[model samples]
Target: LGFGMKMELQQFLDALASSPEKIEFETTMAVIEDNYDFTPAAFTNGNTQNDANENNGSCKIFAFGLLNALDKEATLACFGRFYREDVLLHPENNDHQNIRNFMVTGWEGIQFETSALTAK
Candidate 1:
């Protein structure tokens, strides 16, 4: 059953290969959310199970691959908003430096200046 499902997933990704990466990421996530609903909880636990509370291994693997293709700008903007609201500009927050460190480390490969890359 899992092998069959894996083939189905491979087909989905293959069919999406011609589209924009951002579109692929968006639609792939939509498909997983529709089919596997609570699967993200599996990620938090570092394990997947074929049970009611979480998705199986195949769905988790698909999600992992799909997330890797996400648009860096979109991800950075989302994180920037979160940082501004919850960490950077928050008066009561005590971990601003740590949060900045986490963001910089997590998104190290993503270039912040488009013009710099364009010039290169």
Candidate 2:
């Protein structure tokens, strides 16, 4: 949920009545696919920001991609809680301070599938 910082981040957090720090997430790619609106990920929005270390506003590609593809109403119903409660800000084995979850999103999925494939 590292959209625009300060005001914008606060706004997004406030809209949900909970801050990203307190986000409790549930994985629902199907729902996210249907409701996502951005043409790109928010984290990637930092691509244009002046500071490399700050400004995390790009859409989460995996999350948005999933949300964008799902049925509209169903995704809308799930948006508020999904960003707050369902996403893992910091995954267990990562040192990126949860900020690198964008890369982890696909990586974890890849690992899971690879593990399953190897297991077979």
Candidate 3:
């Protein structure tokens, strides 16, 4: 998510271990916010959740559907690591299938998806 300059997507993978500081986490967040370009978006704990409708987390399920814009292999490889190891999923996570579909779909663009680690 480079602002003025374009970077190789490889940079993201190389910095995966401690990408937060190396990539300027806030700037990446800002870039994501810019890409979102949506009104009433909510970001909690480094997650971009559009909960403006107050659907009790329903919106985010649909949001994941947007990932259908991703490449399946890369998405699975990148997301699988984080999903399986990083955050624990909630029981009532809305629509899991659509979310899966979305992630599998988002493959064409260079998606800088990693972020900085926080105090656990």
Each candidate structure's TM-score, on Cα atoms with residue i matched to residue i, is 0.27, 0.21, 0.25
Q: Once superposed on the true structure, which residue ranges of model 3 sit more than 4 Å away at CA? A: 1-28, 40-68, 72-84, 87-120
Candidate 3 lDDT over residue span 1-120, tens digit each: 455654333355355334432443333333333333333333222223333444322232223224323233323333332333332253335443323433444323212222222211
Q: Write the per-residue lDDT of candidate 1 for residues 21-102, one digit (tens) a residue.
A: 2333344444444344332222221221223233333233323333545333333223333444666567566543433443
User: Who wins the TM-score comparison?
Assistant: 1
Q: Top model by lDDT, which number?
A: 1
Cα shift from native, residue 82, model 2 (Å): 14
Better of 2 and 3 by TM-score: 3
What lDDT is reached at residue 118 by model 2? Answer: 11
**Model 1 residue pairs with clashes:** none
Question: Once superposed on the true structure, which residue ranges of model 1 sit more than 4 Å away at CA?
Answer: 1-36, 41-68, 71-73, 79-81, 90-102, 107-120
Cα lDDT of model 2 by residue, 4-95, tens digit: 32223223324334433333223232223233332331232111221222321222322332423433222232333433334444244433
Best first by lDDT, ranked? 1, 3, 2
For candidate 3, what is the TM-score? 0.25
Worst 10 residues of 3 by lDDT: 111-120
